[PDB]
């Protein structure tokens, strides 16, 4: 799991009075994994050894 | 911070032999915050009290 589950659930509850399903946590974690892997692609294509904010295309 | 920093850095290092900048962590966390808030919008518009995977549009 790549998201901080407790903090995600807190944000959703305090900002929306919403509960958070388990599958929501899974999708968020998968989204982080994909952003990271695309970031690696971008950084390497640029000949760099560090993934930077400009590599996280959002 | 809404991402698990240590686990993000591990993924990027093990999958890309890349380092991870601090600003990368910040962008990932901001992305999670925005996905969560959009998820609250979608769930509430549907009259629900739980943010579900279908509310996280990725």
Numbering used by the authors:
A (entry chain A), B (entry chain A): 4 to 61
Quoted from the paper:
In this study, we present crystal structures and biochemical characterization of the free and DNA-bound forms of the histone homolog HBb from the predatory Gram-negative bacterium Bdellovibrio bacteriovorus. Our findings demonstrate that the single histone fold protein HBb forms a homodimer that has the ability to bind and bend DNA. Furthermore, we establish that HBb is essential for maintaining bacterial viability. Building on this, by employing various biophysical and biochemical approaches, we further substantiated the ability of HBb to bind and compact DNA by bending in a sequence-independent manner.
